[PDB]
Design a binder for this molecule. Structure first.
Ligand SMILES: Nc1nc2c(ncn2[C@@H]2O[C@H](COP(=O)(O)OP(=O)(O)O)[C@@H](O)[C@H]2O)c(=O)[nH]1
Length: 155
């Protein structure tokens, strides 16, 4: 560790805050809508294409109460989808030491959740040391009055 640290100092090492973001899920779940609203904080406005892959960049400022050591973080955002025929292909794009987010529709509920195992396994097969979040969309389609006892159950 001492030699690695001394090499970092000697080789004028800089702090890299850029990281990999991957968006995963079955077709028609709101991956692009997810990325859009998270980037902008507004209701979606963009009509997104049919391309299997969409690439962009995203900066996040630290929220109030954050104890982080960085003012902000940056993500080189990949979003892979498209026809299921290329699913076997898309498996190659998963890597380790990257952030994953799986997108699924809450309205389908358990029907979607079962399928999640497939996608989840596909990440752990090629990303043992990666953090993957899983997010349910279409929360507006869940009745607010029942919402808690629904979402917790689904969780
Ligand atoms: N009402 C509602 N619609 C959503 C929500 N999240 C995503 N969508 C829908 O998802 C669509 C975008 O899906 P998209 O990401 O292009 O599907 P993809 O083919 O899997 O990439 C939009 O037309 C939205 O109507 C949500 O929270 N509420």
């Amino acid at each position: 560790a001492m030699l690695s640290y001394l090499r970092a100092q000697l080789r004028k090492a800089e702090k890299c805050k850029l990281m990999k973001m991957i968006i995963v899920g079955p077709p028609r779940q709101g991956k692009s809508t997810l990325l859009e609203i998270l980037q902008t904080g507004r209701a979606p406005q963009v009509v997104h294409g049919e391309a299997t892959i969409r690439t962009t960049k995203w900066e996040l400022q630290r929220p109030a109460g954050s104890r982080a050591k960085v003012e902000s973080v940056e993500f080189n955002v990949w979003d892979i989808g498209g026809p299921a025929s290329m699913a076997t292909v898309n498996q190659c794009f998963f890597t380790d030491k990257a952030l994953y987010v799986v997108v699924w529709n809450l309205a389908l509920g358990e029907e979607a959740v079962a399928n999640l195992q497939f996608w989840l396994l596909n990440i752990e097969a090629k990303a043992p040391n990666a953090v993957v979040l899983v997010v349910g969309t279409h929360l507006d389609l869940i009745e607010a009055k029942f919402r808690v006892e629904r979402i917790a159950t689904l969780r």
